Design an enzyme around this catalytic site. Structure first.
Site, PDB file in Angstrom:
ATOM      1  CG  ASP A 242      54.737  85.681 -20.031  1.00  0.00           C
ATOM      2  OD1 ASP A 242      55.152  86.845 -20.269  1.00  0.00           O
ATOM      3  OD2 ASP A 242      54.840  85.128 -18.915  1.00  0.00           O
TER       4      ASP A 242
ATOM      5  CB  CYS B  82      57.107  93.790 -29.308  1.00  0.00           C
ATOM      6  SG  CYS B  82      56.937  93.241 -31.060  1.00  0.00           S
ATOM      7  CB  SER B  83      60.697  90.225 -28.724  1.00  0.00           C
ATOM      8  OG  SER B  83      61.993  89.599 -28.749  1.00  0.00           O
TER       9      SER B  83
ATOM     10  N   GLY C 223      59.361  93.031 -33.290  1.00  0.00           N
ATOM     11  CA  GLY C 223      58.843  94.164 -34.065  1.00  0.00           C
ATOM     12  C   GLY C 223      57.748  93.813 -35.070  1.00  0.00           C
ATOM     13  CB  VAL C 224      56.197  91.304 -36.699  1.00  0.00           C
ATOM     14  CG1 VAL C 224      57.475  91.712 -37.487  1.00  0.00           C
ATOM     15  CG2 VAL C 224      56.492  89.981 -35.961  1.00  0.00           C
ATOM     16  N   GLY C 225      54.356  91.436 -34.023  1.00  0.00           N
ATOM     17  CA  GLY C 225      52.996  90.992 -33.645  1.00  0.00           C
ATOM     18  C   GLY C 225      52.396  92.038 -32.716  1.00  0.00           C
TER      19      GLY C 225
END
Ligand SMILES: [Cl-]
Ligand SMILES: [Cl-]
Length: 286
Positions: A187, A221-222, A224-226
């Site tokens: 998380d 992902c959530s 779309g970057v990290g």
């Protein structure tokens, strides 16, 4: 725009970066800060598109966004929060996107159909410690569902300790789509081991190499970057190591950032990429 390191120097290069509390690592990561930053996101900002963004401050650049087809009736019916990203070999090797929202999951599947996508990579859970990250945008079981003008059927689901691989049939023709769902990203911070993400990336890349007809590989992902950018950077650099005498982590991340904001969003993820390469090279050397 690149910082290529010879493989036999990479160990010592990374120790150097890590010295005095990551002094030089931090300096290098900061050089990436401004890359891509001249580019506008005007389409993403249009009133008609506001509900279509999961995060109102994480938007695709106009110059690189993926467009949905449209014909009769078509305000910004062409809009989805998604960007083309180059890989080791060609432009548009990936499409990176946000975690679909309940209201954009039909658009997501439309994009997968129109772009001839056969492989989707998901590097988030739908809910993480109670915080919604992504809608559950595929079927929960083998019972079929419509998404817009498409019908989707989940043909198989294989749950492993760190990822789950699903296969769907989609009818619009009919095509087989594989979904590679990494279920263990912490998380906060990066995965606890390099081996976990290395083995996931290697498994995905095996399947991608077995899909020669396909359009881009979708990764999300959530936002779309990290996590997404870390996954793609690792996929790209692992391919470099197999083909090449050097490895360019800085250059891969630079290239990702030219195409979408924040790709590899934290210094911790940037360190993790180095630790992954360090570990692969140690095992080879031995
Ligand atoms: Cl778009
Ligand atoms: Cl590359």
């Amino acid at each position: 725009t690149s910082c290529p390191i010879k493989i036999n120097q990479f160990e010592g290069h990374f120790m150097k970066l890590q010295a005095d509390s990551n002094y030089l690592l931090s300096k290098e990561y900061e050089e990436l800060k401004d890359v891509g930053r001249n580019q506008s996101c005007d389409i993403a900002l249009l009133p008609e598109n506001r509900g279509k963004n999961r995060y109102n401050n994480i938007l695709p650049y106009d110059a690189t966004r993926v467009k949905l087809s449209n014909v009769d009736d078509d305000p910004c019916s062409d809009y989805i929060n998604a960007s083309y990203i180059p890989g080791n070999n060609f432009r548009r090797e990936y499409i990176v996107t946000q975690g679909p929202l309940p209201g954009t999951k039909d658009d997501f599947w439309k994009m997968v159909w129109e772009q001839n996508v056969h492989n989707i990579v998901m590097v988030t859970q739908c809910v993480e410690k109670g915080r919604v990250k992504c809608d559950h945008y595929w079927p929960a079981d083998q019972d079929s569902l419509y998404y817009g003008d498409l019908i989707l059927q989940m043909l198989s689901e294989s749950v492993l300790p760190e990822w789950t691989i699903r296969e769907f049939k989609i009818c619009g023709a009919h095509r087989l789509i594989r979904h590679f769902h990494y279920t263990v990203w912490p998380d906060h911070g990066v995965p606890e081991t390099t081996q976990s993400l290395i083995q996931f990336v290697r498994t995905v890349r095996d399947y991608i190499n077995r899909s020669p007809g396909a359009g881009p590989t979708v990764v999300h992902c959530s936002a779309g970057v990290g996590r997404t950018g870390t996954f793609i950077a690792l996929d790209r650099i692992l391919q470099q190591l197999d083909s090449k005498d050097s490895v360019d982590i800085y250059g891969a991340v630079h290239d990702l950032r030219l195409h979408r904001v924040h790709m590899v969003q934290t210094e911790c993820q940037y360190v993790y990429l180095h630790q992954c390469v360090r570990d692969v090279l140690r095992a080879r050397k031995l």
